[PDB]
A paper describes a structure:
The N protein plays several roles in the SARS-CoV-2 life cycle, including facilitating viral RNA production, suppressing host cells’ innate immune responses, and packaging viral genomic RNA into developing virions. To accomplish these tasks, the N protein possesses a modular structure with an N-terminal RNA-binding domain (RBD) and a C-terminal dimerization domain (CTD), plus three intrinsically disordered regions (IDRs) at the N- and C-termini and between the RBD and CTD.
Next, we co-crystallized sdAb-E2 with the N protein CTD. CDR1 structurally stabilizes CDR2 and CDR3, but makes no direct contact with the N protein. The majority of the interface involves three aromatic residues on CDR3 – W102, Y104, and F105 – with W102 and Y104 laying nearly flat against the NCTD β-sheet. sdAb-E2 also makes specific hydrogen bonds with Q281 of both NCTD protomers, with one Q281 residue making a salt-bridge interaction with both the main chain and side chain of sdAb-E2 S106, and the other Q281 hydrogen bonding sdAb-E2 residue R54. On the NCTD, sdAb-E2 contacts three residues – T325, S327, and T334 – that are mutated in 373 (0.08%), 511 (0.10%), and 990 (0.20%) SARS-CoV-2 genome samples, respectively. No major variants of concern show mutations in the NCTD, illustrating the high conservation of this domain and the potential utility of sdAb-E2 for robust N protein recognition. Addition of sdAb-E2, which binds the CTD, did not strongly affect formation of N+RNA condensates.
Author numbering:
A (entry chain I): 0 to 135
B (entry chain A), C (entry chain B): 269 to 364
Amino acid sequence: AEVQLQASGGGLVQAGGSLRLSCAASGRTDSTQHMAWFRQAPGKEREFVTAIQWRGGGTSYTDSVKGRFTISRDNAKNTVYLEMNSLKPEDTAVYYCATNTRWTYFSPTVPDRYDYWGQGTQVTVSSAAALEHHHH
Amino acid sequence: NVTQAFGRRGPEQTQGNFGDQELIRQGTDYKHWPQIAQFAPSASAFFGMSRIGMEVTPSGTWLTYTGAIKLDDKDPNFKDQVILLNKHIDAYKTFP
Amino acid sequence: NVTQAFGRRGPEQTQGNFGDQELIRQGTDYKHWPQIAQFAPSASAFFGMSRIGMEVTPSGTWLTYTGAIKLDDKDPNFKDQVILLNKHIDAYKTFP
């Protein structure tokens, strides 16, 4: 457990709303080569969302989130952000950030190629149903 | 020309990030290109000092690389070289 | 000799990882070196396709670079080219 990942930023928003997920890396961050985000919707398989190179900063995205999601990292701190705009009901899922240690140029897209994992963050996009939650 | 040959400058892994609009449009005809090209490694140097990989992805099979070139601090034009290189690194972020 | 010019092959980012014992010892006189050198980028390709950066460390100021060169599966020698490149990528792990 050389590297620890702290994830946050999940919430409940309406369609078209925005959220920002964060994944702060601690420990031996020097060995980190790629940081990625995965998501799992109800009754569906874990799907790759986005990833970033820890050194160079090159980014990758799955087709369904291109243009709406943007991953970023200021090179001096070990916290990566995933800005999620124009959220759709299909984005409702549990989001997981992960890191690896093997150097590759392209960020891997399968969970087994990542070594360290953060806590799941729940993201829910609801059609005029947050009102009841606001009241409670 | 640079855009036509390699693509638009951007933050993605499938894109390069080097070059302002002047270098992008002119390319090798850019006035200061020889001063930049001197840092480009030769074939023997490229395969000798870099970390090489073979990566098969949905897009295809790729010869990948990563490395770093130490700039000579005793070079008389060391300071101008840094300015020129920094002048083009991630300049697309400043594009209007 | 590759080791004298570009250092030992190793697992570090500071270290190159390309070259088996024959290529290290022979260098450019290796029989299939031209078949490898063809994949090295030109000056324009290097600065056009690679993701470039700059770091000021105690060891000095470094021009960092990384990129991916697509291999053409269409080339008739694609299989041989992949075999040749894989022969030298991370070959140091099996060195005495």
